[PDB]
Amino acid sequence: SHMCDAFVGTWKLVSSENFDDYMKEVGVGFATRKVAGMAKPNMIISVNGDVITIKSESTFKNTEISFILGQEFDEVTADDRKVKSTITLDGGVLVHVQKWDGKSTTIKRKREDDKLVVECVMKGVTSTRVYERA
Ligand SMILES: O=C(c1cccc(Br)c1)N1CCCCS/C1=N\c1ccccc1
Which PANTHER family does this UniProt record tie to the protein? Predict the structure, then answer.
């Protein structure tokens, strides 16, 4: 057993707050905000050795990242930003920092009760997205 065992599995979105405002702060345009804000993704997290894979599947976009903790990678986000990403585990929280164009956003994922809680921060704006097991 290991690092991310309590994250592994298939998760479904059950609530979202302030996501449109988070996307505005990130610079996402109107039409993408509308369609992405409507999405109800399933998030699939798996581990194989040191490599963690996170898939997001929805009617809007399907994305996949694979990474090693602490090791930067280039990522194309669902909204088509080209970012440099680093994901670490800090006190049991997966912390995902994305850098692009002199900007930065941080996505934190944590287990709380039977939920996986995702907090997305861009400057002063936070969005909270709650997932349950599928
Ligand atoms: O993995 C997704 C993802 C993938 C496919 C669909 C959707 Br909806 C979300 N993330 C990262 C997790 C935290 C939410 S922000 C985000 N992507 C977006 C960022 C800006 C605008 C639109 C989507």
Answer: FATTY ACID BINDING PROTEIN
Measured in angstroms, how far is the CA atom of residue 83 from the centroid of ligand 1?
13
CB burial class (10 A; 0-12, 13-18, 19+) of residue 105? buried
Give the residue extent of every domain in the chain. 5-131
Sorted by sequence, the CB contacts under 8 Å of residue 15 that are 6+ apart come out as 128, 129, 130
Q: Are 122 and 101 in contact (CB under 8 A)?
A: no
Deposited resolution, Å: 1.0
**Technique used to solve these coordinates:** X-ray
Residues 53, 64: contact at Cβ < 8 Å?
yes
Ligand 1 is surrounded, with C-beta below 6 A, by 23, 26, 28, 36, 39, 41, 56, 58, 60-61, 63, 77-79, 107, 118, 120
The answer to whether the beta carbons of residues 14 and 131 sit under 8 Å apart is yes
With 0-12 / 13-18 / 19 or more C-beta atoms within 10 angstroms meaning exposed / middle / buried, residue 43 is: buried
CATH 3.80.10.10 fits 5-131, yes or no: no
Q: At CA 91, angle to CA 51 and CA 134, rounded to 5?
A: 60
